[PDB]
Amino acid sequence: SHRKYEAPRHGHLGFLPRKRAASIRARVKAFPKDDRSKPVALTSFLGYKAGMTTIVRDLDRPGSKFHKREVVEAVTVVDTPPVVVVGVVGYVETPRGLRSLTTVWAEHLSDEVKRRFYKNWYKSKKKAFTKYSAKYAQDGAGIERELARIKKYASVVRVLVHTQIRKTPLAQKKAHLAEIQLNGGSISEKVDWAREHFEKTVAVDSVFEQNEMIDAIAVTKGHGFEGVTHRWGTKKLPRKTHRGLRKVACIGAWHPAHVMWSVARAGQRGYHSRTSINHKIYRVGKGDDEANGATSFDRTKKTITPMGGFVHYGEIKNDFIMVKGCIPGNRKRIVTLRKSLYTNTSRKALEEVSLKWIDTASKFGKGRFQTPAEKHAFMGTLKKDL
Amino acid sequence: VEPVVVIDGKGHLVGRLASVVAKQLLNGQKIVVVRAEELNISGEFFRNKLKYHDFLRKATAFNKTRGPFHFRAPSRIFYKALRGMVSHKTARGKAALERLKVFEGIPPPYDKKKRVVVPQALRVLRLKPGRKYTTLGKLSTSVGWKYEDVVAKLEAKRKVSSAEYYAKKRAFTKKVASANATAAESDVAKQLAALGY
Amino acid sequence: FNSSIGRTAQGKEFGVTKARWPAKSVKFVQGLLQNAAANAEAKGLDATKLYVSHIQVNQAPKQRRRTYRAHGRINKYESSPSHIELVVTEKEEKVVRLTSRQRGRIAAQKRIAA
RNA sequence: CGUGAAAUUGUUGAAAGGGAAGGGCAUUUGAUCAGACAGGCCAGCAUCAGUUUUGGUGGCA
RNA sequence: ACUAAUCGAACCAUCUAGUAGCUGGUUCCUGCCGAAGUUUCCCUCAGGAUAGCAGAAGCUCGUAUCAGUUUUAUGAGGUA
RNA sequence: AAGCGUGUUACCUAUACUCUACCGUCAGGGUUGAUAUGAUGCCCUGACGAGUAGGCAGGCGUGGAGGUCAGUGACGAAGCCUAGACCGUAAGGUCGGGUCGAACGGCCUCUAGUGCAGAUCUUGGUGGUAGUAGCAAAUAUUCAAAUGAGAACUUUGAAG
RNA sequence: AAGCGUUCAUAGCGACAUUGCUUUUUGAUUCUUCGAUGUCGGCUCUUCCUAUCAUACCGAAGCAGAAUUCGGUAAGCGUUGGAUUGUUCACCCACUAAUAGGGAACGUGAGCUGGGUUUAGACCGUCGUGAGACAGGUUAGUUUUACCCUACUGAUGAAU
RNA sequence: AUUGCCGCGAAGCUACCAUCCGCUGGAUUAUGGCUGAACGCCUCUAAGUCAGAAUCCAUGCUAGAACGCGGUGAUUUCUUUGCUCCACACAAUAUAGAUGGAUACGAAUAAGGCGUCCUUGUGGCGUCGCUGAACCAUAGCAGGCUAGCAACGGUGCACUUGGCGGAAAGGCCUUGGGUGCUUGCUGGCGAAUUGCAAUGUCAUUUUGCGUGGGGAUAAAUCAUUUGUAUACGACUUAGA
Ligand SMILES: [Mg+2]
Ligand SMILES: [Mg+2]
Ligand SMILES: [Mg+2]
Ligand SMILES: [Mg+2]
Ligand SMILES: [Mg+2]
Ligand SMILES: [Mg+2]
Ligand SMILES: [Mg+2]
Ligand SMILES: [Mg+2]
Ligand SMILES: [Mg+2]
Ligand SMILES: [Mg+2]
Ligand SMILES: [Mg+2]
Ligand SMILES: [Mg+2]
Ligand SMILES: [Mg+2]
Ligand SMILES: [Mg+2]
Ligand SMILES: [Mg+2]
Ligand SMILES: [Mg+2]
Ligand SMILES: [Mg+2]
Ligand SMILES: [Mg+2]
Ligand SMILES: [Mg+2]
Ligand SMILES: [Mg+2]
Ligand SMILES: [Mg+2]
Ligand SMILES: [Mg+2]
Ligand SMILES: [Mg+2]
Ligand SMILES: [Mg+2]
Ligand SMILES: [Mg+2]
Ligand SMILES: [Mg+2]
Ligand SMILES: [Mg+2]
Ligand SMILES: [Mg+2]
Ligand SMILES: [Mg+2]
Ligand SMILES: [Mg+2]
Ligand SMILES: [Mg+2]
Ligand SMILES: [Mg+2]
Ligand SMILES: [Mg+2]
Ligand SMILES: [Mg+2]
Ligand SMILES: [Mg+2]
Ligand SMILES: [Mg+2]
Ligand SMILES: [Mg+2]
Ligand SMILES: [Mg+2]
Incomplete structure (x- = not known):
């Protein structure tokens, strides 16, 4: 017989299987549609999520009852040192799908990306790309042969970048290598753009800008094996329930004589690839720019790092992106920021954000001071020596 | 009487070409079919699209990954019509189906090779003029073929x-x-x- | 005999996932490997070429004990002892019938290419 | 502690194994094996006999 | 309720292999033949006896007397 | 149309029909002054062959008994094992090889506690499950030394 | 389609008749299960049907607007919180876009609960001489096992 | 004092008890239309065709076939002389089944193909099909030894000049010389006895081992270590 009481399903069937991700760097499964009139730019960037903080700004949207008033919003800051372009991959079109036809690498690879090709770096002879580097030796004719194939064929062109994780307070020592599609220009311009940027960095201000919607692509935070109450949001059973109450009472009817794929069952929670869209950029900050955290309204010569540092990450000494709200994944986690796949004109987009204040009070407690000079002025001179 | 016979799929009726190819493989003849997107089915497009939707809706209820698979490509729609005319669960049927290659378009090396037709499967010879027919390119795309x-x-x-x-x-x-x-x-x-x- | 054993990284060198460390089994084999290797010097064999050519474990007769269950029942609590034996060894370092046709064909072949 | 079966098990050897295994008819392959020169084995052709099948052709009503 | 883990009549031995129209089982091969679940009676209706169907042993004879059939002749019938 | 109705042929294949062979059963016969010496034999002729319950017939096997083979056997009886062989439609029988060590068969008859897959069969033995469930109440153990082949668990000291 | 619908059979209805569909009612049957398929209801959770309550797009009206009514495609997406009752059913309060109807062994007891029915204790009423009966009321009354296979949820992994 | 109790309490986890985020293209149903016959009119329908739903398929998002696939880096000697390539030598290993040749436009089918011409067309004229029963190839001890003639071809073998082919290119078209063979024609010699038939053996796959000619000179796992991870495996990091 019927349920006797209708209710919506628990959990989303399109986010299955709730299994661990294949890689800790979530892959980009779609790039924006290419219009070849614009110059050759990157379609996404790589970053390390540093943490979250607080802003104040004036809302600019008529109709709202907080129009022209100071609203408080949560932002997340991601550490984005420039990516080093070290390769290019041509993709031919085929009645089975895109297919890499060939790849060309820069003649010099840093050790931070050479480490990516090693499981045991410290024992090896470090032989990676040593014979390939002799293809530029005489005059680089063989390299020019491969680049010409990408120009002739390869209707889709993607570039290879690796992070400068040395300039980051991670213990990792090993950079993250990824493919980023090149939009703008035709195939020849895309190949020429890749060739001219070999061994050269690409700043985040050239691919991103303030007030535009970008998407986050990261693996979420792992939680291990989890029961059905916190994995699917199913009702806890009554207190009187014998042999367990954090369960699903009926896991199926008699017929079909099987457990269904759509029944909530215990398993892995978190560490799933997720792609969240429509994160407005609130600030594109710069590394060699003291007063990162200052705005037009603060003028306090302070960076974006909270007082005492970002908890579990460190200080931000490089450039950064600062998007509204929360993105998937935790601190220290490699995140891919991608430009919007469609043009958003919501009026929640298209609106210019001017920050009025950035929080730098410590996130290691109830931080009550924005800067050490502010703490010194309020609290006075202490017993601790100078 | 050729070591590999290559049939051009264009203009053929899918079931009557599948009946001939099934009996051809079972007799030990290697068969390559090319341009499977120009295959044809009798009946109007909407009618055949409904028949695929009835086929799409039948799957194992407790696990969709193990149920009947619904292949989109016109080469695999044609291959789906070859199975069901071949005892594919036997080793003889497995050895028969190994003698079959079906393709979209005409790939190398078959681009510079001779192609034949099967006059009992040709739509222009078989169908009464005025009767409607479906092309396997439109049908496959309308149910999700991306190429x-x-x-x-x-x-x-x-x-x-x-x-x-x-x-x-x-x-x-x-x-x-x-x-x-x-x-x-x-x-x-x-x-x-x-x-x- | 590996149903519901745990999994370890240390099984990779053998291509498995379930592998253990049977301490008491190893001591008994080490005792016999030492005894058998000791026999080889008394026999004059070369120890550097010794290898386990044959090793065989059989079920010894079970040693009975008793366990006590709910509701006044009694079940067996038996040991599964072993017989072990092993051997160590030194390394080590047509008619054709032809029909008259086949004979003639061979003869004609030998007179056709010289 | 005579002999020392089977269930059940270890080693060695052989063989096969995409959601059981096992079996019936036939044959391939591998392995293994009995007998016979004073005709044993497998065949080819001709002319017949018995039972059929497939044609060509002739004379009549 | 309790009367030694036994209680709407304890436990132990014997009568006792108690009776059972009821349940289960009932051990080699091949050959030939081959059923009934219907009649009447029965405190009969999950059972029997009785007739029928079946096997076996044959006996008296040797193409009879016959016949799940028809024809011809002669009746009878009260259904469509 | 590879659909519907109707017509014509060709073709496919049952343990059915025809022919032949072989087996068995039944029926009718032949066969003695040598039946080319086995008359429950040999042979001719024709037909027939499904089968639960059940009936009858002819045989195979086991324990023991009378007779016989002046039978086999420590130069190896019985038993057991044997993807080694042969006979029988079969029940079964025989032989080779290995193991073994003291009795045991063929044939004619007699006799029976005489043949197993079942009975939630009896007694014994053995599996998969499975190196699994578990060895989680009673607050709690730790360090060094000694002994010893071996110490989380013994002894001593210290501490908790 | 006789009539109703101011006139006008068919906007919306519709007598007298008659053709169906369904298996969420109850009958009827006794085919399966009595060397046992755990038995009502509720809770929990998933999925399916459409005979669509709402939501999308429409057609029609005795559609001026508004609100409604009839009908189409359509099950994509929702369909509630409470008082009383064990209740299925029922009834009311209230919110809501709406509070549609069903199925899945009358879904789902090694998932729960145990209020009811349906053991043994006890009381009442009626009936019975009595022991006792009551699909009459009342109260108390042990809800066992997964470690196997599959399925499902996650997690390794030989061979390339 | 089995976490003694109380207040505060970072980190971590966590709440519609907190905050952020939740896409746009096509094809369609009902329905309404266009053009338009059947039926000289009409008509959304018969041929065509427009718009159009919370529908469907894609864009997007998740997983990634552990028997789908691609590109790229490095690939172990001073190491029972290891690895790889090329060639030829011997053995084994198998065979879903060679026995002259898979012999290439594209579209239409109430139309085309080939050739030719013109004013370059949706052109004129001729021709063809009515099956591949074609076309190419094809004679020689399973194809031998040799003599000429005609002609400057045909075909094979390596070498070579240049271009094209990325859908799975891995093949196609060329250029130049050299070396064979020629059955295009005319001759000469040999073949037997495999006994009247016995596939009467002519292949391409895989693997070892050998010989001589080049080339290169790594990693991964366990163990230790981290916590962006975690029941264990696994994952993600560090270490001359
Ligand atoms: Mg419902
Ligand atoms: Mg965040
Ligand atoms: Mg904090
Ligand atoms: Mg089957
Ligand atoms: Mg366990
Ligand atoms: Mg116990
Ligand atoms: Mg013994
Ligand atoms: Mg055994
Ligand atoms: Mg399997
Ligand atoms: Mg004849
Ligand atoms: Mg008795
Ligand atoms: Mg008794
Ligand atoms: Mg009979
Ligand atoms: Mg009975
Ligand atoms: Mg009458
Ligand atoms: Mg009457
Ligand atoms: Mg017909
Ligand atoms: Mg019979
Ligand atoms: Mg019988
Ligand atoms: Mg005896
Ligand atoms: Mg003996
Ligand atoms: Mg055996
Ligand atoms: Mg003795
Ligand atoms: Mg007996
Ligand atoms: Mg037995
Ligand atoms: Mg029996
Ligand atoms: Mg038993
Ligand atoms: Mg355990
Ligand atoms: Mg304790
Ligand atoms: Mg409907
Ligand atoms: Mg039920
Ligand atoms: Mg259940
Ligand atoms: Mg229960
Ligand atoms: Mg109760
Ligand atoms: Mg105490
Ligand atoms: Mg009009
Ligand atoms: Mg994906
Ligand atoms: Mg994979």
């Missing part, structure tokens, strides 16, 4: 390369058939004319 425009760009590319092959072959056929025509009214020619050659 109609890719095959079309490569098929038109091959036709350009093949039309200008036939251009110089016409010129060479002209030269050969001229010297043979002059070789007539000769002594050797009139003897072969009595012997029928």
Whole structure:
């Protein structure tokens, strides 16, 4: 017989299987549609999520009852040192799908990306790309042969970048290598753009800008094996329930004589690839720019790092992106920021954000001071020596 | 009577070409089918689209990954019609189906190879004129095949390369058939004319 | 005998996932490997070439004990002892019938290519 | 502690194994094996006999 | 309720292999033949007896007397 | 149309029909002054062959008994094992090889506690489960030394 | 389609008749299960049907607007919180876009609970001489096992 | 004092008890239309065709076939002389089944193909099909030894000049010389006895081992270590 009481399903069937991700760097499964009139730019960037903080700004949207008033919003800051372009991959079109036809690498690879090709770096002879580097030796004719194939064929062109994780307070020592599609220009311009940027960095201000919607692509935070109450949001059973109450009472009817794929069952929670869209950029900050955290309204010569540092990450000494709200994944986690796949004109987009204040009070407690000079002025001179 | 027989899928009826190919493989003939997107089915497009939707909705209820698979490509729709005409669960049927290659478009090496047709499967020979028919390119795309425009760009590319092959072959056929025509009214020619050659 | 054993990284060198460390089993084999290797010097064999050519474990007769269950029942609590034996060894370092056709074909072949 | 079966098990050897295994008819392959020169084995052709099948052709009503 | 883990009549031995129209089982091969679940009676209706169907042993004879059939002749019938 | 109705042929294949062979059963016969010496034999002729419950017939096997083979056997009886062989439609019988060590068969008859897959069969033995469930109440153990082949668990000291 | 619908059979209805569909009612049957398929209801959770309550797009009206009514495609997406009752059913309060109807062994007891029915204790009423009966009321009354296979949820992994 | 109790309490986890985020293209149903016959009119329908739903398929998002696939880096000697390539030598290993040749336009089918011409067309004229029963190839001890003649061809073998082919290119078209063979024609010599038939053996796959000619000179796992991870495996990091 019927349920006797209708209710919506628990959990989303399109986010299955709730299994661990294949890689800790979530892959980009779609790039924006290419219009070849614009110059050759990157379609996404790589970053390390540093943490979250607080802003104040004036809302600019008529109709709202907080129009022209100071609203408080949560932002997340991601550490984005420039990516080093070290390769290019041509993709031919085929009645089975895109297919890499060939790849060309820069003649010099840093050790931070050479480490990516090693499981045991410290024992090896470090032989990676040593014979390939002799293809530029005489005059680089063989390299020019491969680049010409990408120009002739390869209707889709993607570039290879690796992070400068040395300039980051991670213990990792090993950079993250990824493919980023090149939009703008035709195939020849895309190949020429890749060739001219070999061994050269690409700043985040050239691919991103303030007030535009970008998407986050990261693996979420792992939680291990989890029961059905916190994995699917199913009702806890009554207190009187014998042999367990954090369960699903009926896991199926008699017929079909099987457990269904759509029944909530215990398993892995978190560490799933997720792609969240429509994160407005609130600030594109710069590394060699003291007063990162200052705005037009603060003028306090302070960076974006909270007082005492970002908890579990460190200080931000490089450039950064600062998007509204929360993105998937935790601190220290490699995140891919991608430009919007469609043009958003919501009026929640298209609106210019001017920050009025950035929080730098410590996130290691109830931080009550924005800067050490502010703490010194309020609290006075202490017993601790100078 | 050829070691590998290559059928051009264009203009054929899917089931009658599947009946011939099934019996051809079971008799030990290797068969390659090309341009499976121009295969045809009798009946109007909407009617055949409904028949695929009835096929799409049947799946294992407790696990969709193990149920009937619903292949989108027109080469695999045709292959789905070959199975069901072949005892595919036996090792003889497995060895038969190994003698089959089905393709979209005409890939190498079959681009420069001779293609045949099956007159009992040809729609222009089989269908009553005025009766509607479905093309396997439109049907497959309408149910989720993603490579109609890719095959079309490569098929038109091959036709350009093949039309200008036939251009110089016409010129060479002209030269050969001229010297043979002059070789007539000769002594050797009139003897072969009595012997029928 | 590996149903519901745990999994370890240390099984990779053998291509498995379930592998253990049977301490008491190893001591008994080490005792016999030492005894058998000791026999080889008394026999004059070369110890550097010794290898386990044959090793065989059989079920010894079970040693009975008793366990006590709910509701006044009694079940067996038996040991599964072993017989072990092993050997160590030194390393080590047509008619054709032809029919008259086949004979003639061979003879004609030998007179056709010289 | 005579002999020392089977269930069940270890080693060695052989063989096969995409959601059981096992079996019936036939044959391939591998392995293994009995008998016989004073005709044993497998065949080819001709002319017949018995039972059929497939044609060509002739004379009549 | 309790009367030694036994209680709407304990436990132990014997009568006792108690009776059962009821349940289960009932051990080699091949050959030939081959059923009934219907009649009447029965405190009969999950059972029997009785007739029928079946096997076996044959006996008296040797193509009879016959016949799940028809024809011809002669009746009878009260259904469609 | 590879659909519907109707017509014509060709073709496919049952343990069915025809022919032949072989087996068995039944029926009718032949066969003695040598039946080319086995008359429950040999042979001719024709037909027939499904089968639960059940009936009858002819046989195979086991324990013991009378007779016989002046049977086999420590130069190896019985038993057991044997993808080694042969006979029988079969029940079964025989032989080779290995193991073994003291009795045991063929044939004619007698006799029976005489043939197993079942009975939630009896007694004994053994599996998979499975190196699994578990060895989680009673607050709690730790360090060094000694002994010893071996110490989380013994002894002593210290501490908790 | 006789009539209703101011007139006008068919906007919306519709007598007298008649053709169906369904298996969420109850009958009827006794085919399966009595060397046992755990038995009502509720809770929990998933999925399916459409005979659509709402939501999308429409057609029609005795559609001026508004609000409604009839009908189409359509099950994509929702369909509630409470008082009383064990209740299925029922009834009311209230919110809501709406509070549609069903199925899945009358879904789902090694998932729960145990209020009811349906053991043994006890009381009442009626009936019975009595022991006792009551699909009459009342109260108390042990809800066992997964470690196997599959399925499902996650997690390794030989061979390339 | 089995976490003694109380207040505060970072980190971590966590709440519609907190905050952020939740896309746009096509094809369609009902329905309404266009053009338009059947039926000289009409008509959304018969041929065509427009718009159009919370529908469907894609864009997007998740997983990634552990028997789908691609590109790229490095690939172990001073190491029972290891690895790889090329060639030829011997053995084994198998065979879903060679026995002259898979012999290439594209579209239409109430139309085309080939040739030719013109004013370059949706052109004129001729011719063809009515099956591949074709075309190419095809004679020689399973194809031998040799003599000429005609002609400057045909075909094979390596070498080579240049171009094209990325859908799975891995093949196609060429250029130049050299070396064979030629059955295009005319000759000479040999073949036997495999006994009247016995596939009467002519292949391409895989693997070892050998010989001589080049080339290169790594990693991964366990163990230790981290916590962006975690029941264990696994994952993600560090270490001359
Ligand atoms: Mg419902
Ligand atoms: Mg965040
Ligand atoms: Mg904090
Ligand atoms: Mg089957
Ligand atoms: Mg366990
Ligand atoms: Mg116990
Ligand atoms: Mg013994
Ligand atoms: Mg055994
Ligand atoms: Mg399997
Ligand atoms: Mg004859
Ligand atoms: Mg008795
Ligand atoms: Mg009794
Ligand atoms: Mg009979
Ligand atoms: Mg009975
Ligand atoms: Mg009458
Ligand atoms: Mg009457
Ligand atoms: Mg017909
Ligand atoms: Mg019989
Ligand atoms: Mg019987
Ligand atoms: Mg006896
Ligand atoms: Mg013996
Ligand atoms: Mg055996
Ligand atoms: Mg003795
Ligand atoms: Mg007995
Ligand atoms: Mg037994
Ligand atoms: Mg029996
Ligand atoms: Mg039993
Ligand atoms: Mg355990
Ligand atoms: Mg304790
Ligand atoms: Mg409907
Ligand atoms: Mg139920
Ligand atoms: Mg259940
Ligand atoms: Mg229960
Ligand atoms: Mg109760
Ligand atoms: Mg105490
Ligand atoms: Mg009009
Ligand atoms: Mg994906
Ligand atoms: Mg994979």
